[model samples]
Target: MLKQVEIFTDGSCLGNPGPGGYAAILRYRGREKTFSAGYTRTTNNRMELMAAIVALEALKEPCEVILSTDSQYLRQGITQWIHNWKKRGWKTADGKPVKNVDLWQRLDAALGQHQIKWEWVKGHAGHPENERCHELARAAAMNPTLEDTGYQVEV
Candidate 1:
């Protein structure tokens, strides 16, 4: 069966640990839908992970998904580092605690529900969907914030 869905995701932060937001654009059969949220205190990485996770969770059933993002951290974490971290009981290869373990776990769970092909794109470039996602992220970040219960690091 042909994969019929495409997603573009992005995250933004006003400061390194300030208000953060995530956006995901889902396109299927010429229709589009967007998802976005904000956190009062969170990191960009968490928002990035959240965008992809939210997008996947929105799917009604198992299907092929082309998930695109601008963050190497998000992409590499899923495609590469996550396996090692999971095998090591959520610790990095060096035995240090992995950052954003909560988000990673959630993302992993969301991923299992679908067949996803991940793509990395350049942020703020000419990609229409990516740019729209970026704009949504930035707008959300500027809106009223919500508590980030998952954030454990210093802000």
Candidate 2:
């Protein structure tokens, strides 16, 4: 049965590009599944983007998804910014290359075959799901294992 799925997502990192993690919770018909993963080296923004990507990719079939998140960067970038970014060859009109292009492109591909709505909630506002997701993310970050190859370290 393909009922609308509600998802909450969050990300955490010990430092700007240190141990990081991403998490998402999916709810449908009163059942919920929570997910989290840690990365050895990554940025908070990358983890944030990764959370939504992981959530959508987990759905085995086409779905109607309401994605609730705390990152305006994710919401605004996907909902309003990706258009001209693409028109400019993923470049900003001001002549800068877009950040997180790798994940952004992957996210674009994941958006295919799903009906999605974006919802924004203020972080640390006592929203239970959001707060739980934050804790899950932080916990994962504190115990990171896998390497984040996409995260480049400037030598």
Candidate 3:
């Protein structure tokens, strides 16, 4: 098997519940690949989780993955909170349902195919890869026509 592939991801939102986008940069063999998408109405957490889901889904085969993200929610949820959620049937520790459960489930499914080492990085701190991802996300967020199938503003 190839040694390891590293991915850096970021998500941006114009408002708490407004236009949002996600970006992912995958590195392998000294080369980098990128993916990004925009949504007309979504939350930062949604975009954050979506970045990871999309990046992992892009992998062609099982491999060791180093997933780096700027969102603490993404890192902590997958690394820590998910276990309890799954054990409790997707409920939170307070017996309440989890937010963004759909995205969490999607991420978990994508995770099953790879061995991942999740890394949390401070965003916009001069980290080259993370900055690139953030730029992509912000640019994509400016697309007005983008729409999230799962998250929409009621008209």
- Predicted model with the maximum TM-score: 1
What ranking of all candidate models by TM-score puts the best one first? 1, 3, 2
For model 3 the TM-score comes to 0.87
- How do all models score by TM-score? 0.88, 0.87, 0.87
RMSD over all Cα atoms, model 1 = 2.3
Q: What tens digits encode model 3's per-residue C-alpha lDDT throughout 1-155?
A: 34799888998887878889999998766667799988888888889998998888888888799888888779779778998888999987788667788899989898898989877887656378888899999988888357667663332
Rank order (by lDDT, best first): 2, 3, 1
Candidate 2 residue spans exceeding 4 A from truth: 28-31, 94-97, 153-155
What local distance difference test score does each model get?
Answer: 0.83, 0.84, 0.83
Q: In model 3, where do residues sit more than 4 Å from their true spots?
A: 28-31, 93-96, 124-126, 152-155
User: What are the RMSD figures for all models against the true structure?
Assistant: 2.3, 2.6, 3.0
Superposed Cα deviation of residue 102, candidate 3 (Å): 0.7
Write model 2 residue lDDT over 1-155, tens digit each, in one string: 33689889998986878999999998865678899999988988889898988888777778788888897668778878898788899886678667778888888888887888878888757378888999999999999988877776542
Candidate whose lDDT is highest: 2
